[PDB]
Amino acid sequence: VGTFENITAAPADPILGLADLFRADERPGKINLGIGLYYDETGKIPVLTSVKKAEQYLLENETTKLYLGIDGIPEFGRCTQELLFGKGSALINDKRARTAQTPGGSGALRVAADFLAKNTSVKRVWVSNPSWPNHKSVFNSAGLEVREYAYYDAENHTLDFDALINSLNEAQAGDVVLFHGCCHNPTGIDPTLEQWQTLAQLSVEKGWLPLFDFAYQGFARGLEEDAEGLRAFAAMHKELIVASSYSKNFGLYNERVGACTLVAADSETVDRAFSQMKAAIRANYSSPPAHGASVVATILSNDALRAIWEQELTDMRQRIQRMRQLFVNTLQEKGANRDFSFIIKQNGMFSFSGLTKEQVLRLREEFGVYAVASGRVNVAGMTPDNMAPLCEAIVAVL
Amino acid sequence: VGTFENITAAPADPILGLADLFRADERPGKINLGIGLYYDETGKIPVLTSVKKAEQYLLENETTKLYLGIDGIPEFGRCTQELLFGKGSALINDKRARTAQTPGGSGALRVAADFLAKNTSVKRVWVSNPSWPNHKSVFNSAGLEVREYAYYDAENHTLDFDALINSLNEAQAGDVVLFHGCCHNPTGIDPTLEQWQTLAQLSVEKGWLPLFDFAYQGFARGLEEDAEGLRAFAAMHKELIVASSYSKNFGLYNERVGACTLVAADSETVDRAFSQMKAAIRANYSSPPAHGASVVATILSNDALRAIWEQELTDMRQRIQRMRQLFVNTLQEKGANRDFSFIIKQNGMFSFSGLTKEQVLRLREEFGVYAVASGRVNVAGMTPDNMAPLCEAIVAVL
Ligand SMILES: Cc1ncc(COP(=O)(O)O)c(C=O)c1O
Ligand SMILES: Cc1ncc(COP(=O)(O)O)c(C=O)c1O
């Protein structure tokens, strides 16, 4: 009697399964608007110049591949805290935060989930509906219940703040509430500063533990501005957790560079808690991969490389905003009667197109255009060369 | 009332806690025989030449960092299966095996444990007494019970084959039994081929699911020879799991390069099982880090680089063998009256020294010689320059 005989096949990942269909499609002119990769104006996914410079430096100067500590490169953790909280933050001066280098933002989310499930009485995590599909899997893998809160007004293409507030009414003291720090995935709709401040006050009154997922810092307005919501929470909370990723804003997707940051009331408490976070990492992958995080730490700690990187990040933010405008314009030019102007108000790589599952299927099967079944399209996959055919396809299924 | 306030500090890792103490130790003569790192004759922990050359190729030819698939680089998987099972194996031609690239051997162990606990009826894993200390933590954290079988005869410094087989008669069908492929950690004592064949037959009769941990392929006798015990299992079993590591045989510790290989009765079953292993990876770190695995796959797939690497591995293995001999001879010269000849018959980086916990504590506090509290010593940390002080210290505590 085989152990593997009773196993049920896993469903296809809603995002990665799509990219597998795309790689199999033999039809010429297929267009990939699925997975969240940054493409340049020629349809390629390049390595940043700042990253190549840093990798050259590492090649010439690394003398050993000796294991990192469980929590990773120390300079990486410190530069990360400055990015998130600000160079002179009280949180850093009071030594209230500890950061672990992790394998991507995904790995940072799993490390937090394992830590919470094993060392606290947290039973429940609240996630926006919609959210990144993998959020539920990560927290469920540690045995945590995941509930959903309302977020998106699909009528006005706006944040439904009233429904958000009402739907979080039953989130209890000691529940985790997950917020996207900026560039909400998939809607591209973020709270305003005043909405963030309102959420911060309510969180402290209700006793929630906030967990911020930061995968797109620098893609909305700028590095400092995109962190304003987080910093409004950090000014008011004793405790919070930040999972952050450098996959997107350094174009380091496949090197798995992220961080999990813990904040507690004081230095002694966060050190105690962090020692249990390190134990959860040790029972998982033991210590994190060095190459990607070394690149990031090299760039952030060298003024000249850092200035190259900040300009590269700006050029990527601006290309995406330009494509958002060109998309709306070309849809009108190609004859759409539906108003797509809301696309211009959305932030980051993704917008909710408002297409139905049926229309997304038609686009894939009839026109070779690949989006996620929720209607999320990757605007950063749009180029001046593929824009007209893409828009003709959409207009055809409207 | 903070969520983190009542968390208890985690105890130190028996291996990584020692490394921290050693780093902080201010004495210039300190000697590190704890963590399993390869040192060259001069006390350095070098990057291999094959690896530097492969990294230079990657630097100049890499055009993108786009995500690998969940299971990683395909050539890496194929080359791993060839090393494990042999260039013309029936497991491979029958398409009975699927491999996922993982963040180290540690990550491969957690992926297997998550996959087992979430998709099968397995409740119990059997691990040798003694074993690598992190084995229990990994399987306990996935929710599996850990049971110990007998292995080492401490009086005779030998494998107690009878005790082992008696202990394992309590293991039931559908339990997982974990075997070290070669260079048993910490004892350095491995089954002979005959004993492997005996366990393999006994394994099918009782219905165990074998799990091989293969972190030292090439450090006992040779690449092919060190897999004989696994290949005897593979010829008889419908199902098995191998977690393997390239940290040590490539000196790639901090890049986290390993693999989890699943074997099932046929191609249809292993694909069904592998789909759930991918789901378990997706909810952990999503996809594995590219740099380290790309280096390995570049080396194994290029005949000139492979030849360099295979010579560098031979040199490491022989250097360790020369140190085992030198250690025994120098102990007698420095006035030890115990017979340490058993060290010569142990394989790999580690010997079980027979020192007590109290003697190990003295070696550290009074002499700055760092060994694990079990008395395991890293022979690969021994050099001609530190042999005399190390042996004088040991004689002083007998
Ligand atoms: C909201 C959110 N969190 C986490 C991630 C995962 O990032 P990473 O590739 O660093 O694991 C993504 C993007 O993939 C994301 O959009
Ligand atoms: C038996 C055994 N399994 C697994 C590992 C973990 O290897 P890695 O560093 O690749 O995670 C080690 C040592 O590191 C080991 O000795």
Numbering used by the authors:
A (entry chain A), B (entry chain B): -1 to 396
The authors write:
E. coli aspartate aminotransferase (AAT) is a pyridoxal phosphate (PLP)-dependent enzyme that catalyses the reversible transamination of l-aspartate with α-ketoglutarate, yielding oxaloacetate and l-glutamate. Using our approach, we enrich the less populated but catalytically active closed conformation in order to increase catalytic efficiency (kcat/KM) with the non-native substrate l-phenylalanine, leading to altered substrate selectivity.
To determine if these differences in the temperature dependence of exchange could be observed in the crystal state, we also solved the maleate-free structures of WT, HEX, and VFIT at 303 K, and calculated isomorphous difference density maps by subtracting electron density at 278 K. By contrast, similar comparisons for WT and HEX showed relatively little difference density. We calculated ΔG at 278 K for HEX to be –1.72 kcal mol–1, a small difference that would be compatible with the interconversion between these two states to be part of the catalytic cycle.
